[PDB]
Amino acid sequence: TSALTYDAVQVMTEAFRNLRKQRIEISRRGNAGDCLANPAVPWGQGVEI
Amino acid sequence: FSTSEFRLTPHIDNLEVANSFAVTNAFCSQFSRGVYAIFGFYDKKSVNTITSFCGTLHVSFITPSFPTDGTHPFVIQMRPDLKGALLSLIEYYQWDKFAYLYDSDRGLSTLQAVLDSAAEKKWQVTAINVGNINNDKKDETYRSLFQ
Amino acid sequence: FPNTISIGGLFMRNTVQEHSAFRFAVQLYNTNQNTTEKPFHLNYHVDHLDSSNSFSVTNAFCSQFSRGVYAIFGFYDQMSMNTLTSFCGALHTSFVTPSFPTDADVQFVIQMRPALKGAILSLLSYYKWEKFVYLYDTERGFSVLQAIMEAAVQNNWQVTARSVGNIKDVQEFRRIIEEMDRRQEKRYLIDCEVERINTILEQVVILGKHSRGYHYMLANLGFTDILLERVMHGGANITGFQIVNNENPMVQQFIQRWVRLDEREFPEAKNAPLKYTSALTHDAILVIAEAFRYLRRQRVDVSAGDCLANPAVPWSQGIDIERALKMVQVQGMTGNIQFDTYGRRTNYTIDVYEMKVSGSRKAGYWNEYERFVPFIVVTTILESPYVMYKKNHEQLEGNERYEGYCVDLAYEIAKHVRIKYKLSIVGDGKYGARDPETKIWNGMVGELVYG
Ligand SMILES: *[C@@H]1O[C@H](CO)[C@@H](O[C@@H]2O[C@H](CO)[C@@H](O[C@@H]3O[C@H](CO)[C@@H](O)[C@H](O)[C@@H]3O)[C@H](O)[C@H]2NC(C)=O)[C@H](O)[C@H]1NC(C)=O
Ligand SMILES: *[C@@H]1O[C@H](CO)[C@@H](O[C@@H]2O[C@H](CO)[C@@H](O[C@@H]3O[C@H](CO)[C@@H](O)[C@H](O)[C@@H]3O)[C@H](O)[C@H]2NC(C)=O)[C@H](O)[C@H]1NC(C)=O
Ligand SMILES: *[C@@H]1O[C@H](CO)[C@@H](O[C@@H]2O[C@H](CO)[C@@H](O[C@@H]3O[C@H](CO)[C@@H](O)[C@H](O)[C@@H]3O)[C@H](O)[C@H]2NC(C)=O)[C@H](O)[C@H]1NC(C)=O
């Protein structure tokens, strides 16, 4: 499990570097809202992630 | 794995994993911070909470835990399948009657897989759960088990 | 003391008749016209669950908690089991349910549907089965599967199991039945849903030649809803399970009060038989009524906020309400109703019906304390001078067509016994043999072995 954690950190770093190399700006702030929003509308830029 | 183009910021939450209420609290605390991805574990019983709250809100979840039974969106997993390798090992060893001491804390997918392939290959599985035995009297129960 | 008791209703898909029985039980409780058994007024709020996911269940539970209730009657599946048990054990909210019993031992969960594995293992020990087939899904718990596995370990049984919960094509069911025919299996135990049991029985009827000489133990409480009419016309017997006794006069009074309802205010009430889940709903309403009457008689207090507060700080009175839901001893539609310290059923009775070729009967009842308490072809071959046909053999009928040594021998055996017989002829013309490959006896030997 520790080795899979060490590999998953590399996977997340490579994916965020691919976002940084594809010039895709998804930057926002800490205003995602309540987790129990009704209806909780999604944000589309996670679908690319 | 620190880079030059950016910098990650992990929000570490050391809570329980079997109680889904604390999992929901930690998930909503991470969601109130406005995060893009969540790394974490999940228990065998609290897999549905993780898959529901990560497929509905479309937030990706990377995990080293056991593989699920089904295709849930936004669930990236690090542990590969164990059932196919185990069936390949038995078919390489050419078995027909064996015992299977399993634990009930990572689901029962491997048990269903080995029972289906054992009945398809005409085998004799003596499958016994061991997870329901407490830590206080786990010496005479194991003696009766191996008897 | 309220004088205002509002409860919550969690209804998933396929909960129409259960919602109607819930509303009708609330209507029966509110229209008692007596100051003793009706000491207050009962209110309720209904949230219909669209999906089985934990997100909608969590939203409905937080809506019921922010509304302010004292008890929540609801349903759950595999996808919403741990969510409801965790949110109801963390916030100390008592949760009543007629759904499948959970595997683990938890708190604040009052289960109306009793456990089934004790009666199943008792009927397995009574029928002396040691080699059988076990079809199962996952949608009603894993306690029955683990019980069957443990009993096969202890009693040295041969269980051929199939997880059929993910199968949608009926050709897989057909090849599983053909494979069990190739293993010469005659005994089946199906722990599945009602629609899946109906699908498997339709595949038995359409595939055919799977009725006479077979026994299908249907380990499910929806025995009134299983379409088994075409199975009964082939010669198969079925061991079923019911917890709703029609000889109970409270049940038939509920039927007489149930069939006179309108379709507009109570759908699925006249055009469908009464499911066991609706009777469990009515018995749950009776248990909740007895619990709040006991809370009023003992002067115990029952008297908002966020469901995700950090920390939670639950209101401590509901544990006593949990105690009030763990000491109810009543007589409802399923008979005696009590509860243990985990909210499981005890002191109850499961009715077992056998439907053989002679017809249907109540073969006995099950109790967890004591036990399940229950309550001529003659063949030959044409050989001279043993069996020969007559000259004008077409001019007669019956056993008089044949003649010879063994015919007179059979007549003397019937004279010294006094039982009527029937002279039959073996079709394949073989005497008796066993192939080394198929291990199947043929001829008259195969006629005697295979019945
Ligand atoms: C209202 O509903 C109940 C339905 O039974 C009735 O209240 C009952 O009142 C009796 C009076 O003592 C309670 O004791 C019973 O007495 C009878 C006759 O002595 C006895 O045979 C019983 O074994 C019992 O001791 C009884 O517990 C009580 N029932 C309940 C459920 O509380 C009452 O008749 C109804 N009508 C009115 C106008 O109150
Ligand atoms: C119906 O289900 C039962 C299992 O519940 C099947 O098993 C048993 O089959 C035998 C053969 O007819 C019957 O019992 C036997 O009775 C004789 C005396 O006549 C006795 O010497 C034997 O030891 C045996 O008990 C009976 O049908 C049944 N046994 C009991 C206790 O019910 C049966 O085969 C199934 N029927 C069909 C058509 O598949
Ligand atoms: C626990 O389960 C047992 C089944 O093993 C059941 O016990 C039965 O409870 C009823 C209700 O009280 C008893 O009926 C009454 O018994 C008294 C004698 O104490 C008698 O005077 C009454 O006229 C009435 O018949 C019954 O005897 C008793 N036992 C059996 C074998 O049926 C019941 O389901 C649970 N017991 C309790 C106390 O809830």
GROMACS .gro file of C-alpha atoms and ligand atoms in nm, chain C residues 127 129 213-215 235 237 239 354 356, ligand 2:
model
   49
  323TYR     CA    1  -3.441  -3.309   0.460
  325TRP     CA    2  -2.935  -3.283   0.199
  409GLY     CA    3  -3.802  -3.567  -0.983
  410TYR     CA    4  -3.684  -3.220  -0.875
  411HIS     CA    5  -3.717  -3.006  -0.564
  431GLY     CA    6  -4.463  -3.257  -1.106
  433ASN     CA    7  -4.251  -2.973  -0.533
  435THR     CA    8  -4.060  -2.557  -0.026
  550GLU     CA    9  -4.498  -2.747   0.068
  552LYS     CA   10  -4.640  -3.123  -0.390
  649LIG     C1   11  -4.035  -3.347  -0.262
  649LIG     O1   12  -3.935  -3.297  -0.173
  649LIG     C2   13  -3.880  -3.400  -0.090
  649LIG     C3   14  -3.781  -3.334   0.003
  649LIG     O2   15  -3.846  -3.244   0.091
  649LIG     C4   16  -3.819  -3.514  -0.173
  649LIG     O3   17  -3.771  -3.619  -0.088
  649LIG     C5   18  -3.836  -3.746  -0.040
  649LIG     O4   19  -3.860  -3.844  -0.150
  649LIG     C6   20  -3.899  -3.974  -0.102
  649LIG     C7   21  -3.926  -4.058  -0.225
  649LIG     O5   22  -4.064  -4.056  -0.259
  649LIG     C8   23  -4.019  -3.965  -0.008
  649LIG     O6   24  -3.980  -4.000   0.124
  649LIG     C9   25  -3.944  -4.139   0.138
  649LIG     O7   26  -4.051  -4.217   0.191
  649LIG    C10   27  -4.021  -4.357   0.210
  649LIG    C11   28  -4.148  -4.428   0.253
  649LIG     O8   29  -4.242  -4.419   0.147
  649LIG    C12   30  -3.907  -4.369   0.313
  649LIG     O9   31  -3.873  -4.506   0.331
  649LIG    C13   32  -3.784  -4.290   0.264
  649LIG    O10   33  -3.680  -4.296   0.361
  649LIG    C14   34  -3.818  -4.145   0.229
  649LIG    O11   35  -3.842  -4.077   0.351
  649LIG    C15   36  -4.075  -3.824  -0.005
  649LIG    O12   37  -4.123  -3.788  -0.134
  649LIG    C16   38  -3.969  -3.723   0.039
  649LIG     N1   39  -3.946  -3.733   0.182
  649LIG    C17   40  -4.008  -3.654   0.271
  649LIG    C18   41  -3.973  -3.678   0.415
  649LIG    O13   42  -4.088  -3.568   0.237
  649LIG    C19   43  -3.910  -3.560  -0.287
  649LIG    O14   44  -3.837  -3.642  -0.377
  649LIG    C20   45  -3.970  -3.442  -0.362
  649LIG     N2   46  -4.065  -3.487  -0.462
  649LIG    C21   47  -4.040  -3.483  -0.593
  649LIG    C22   48  -4.149  -3.533  -0.683
  649LIG    O15   49  -3.933  -3.441  -0.638
   0.00000   0.00000   0.00000
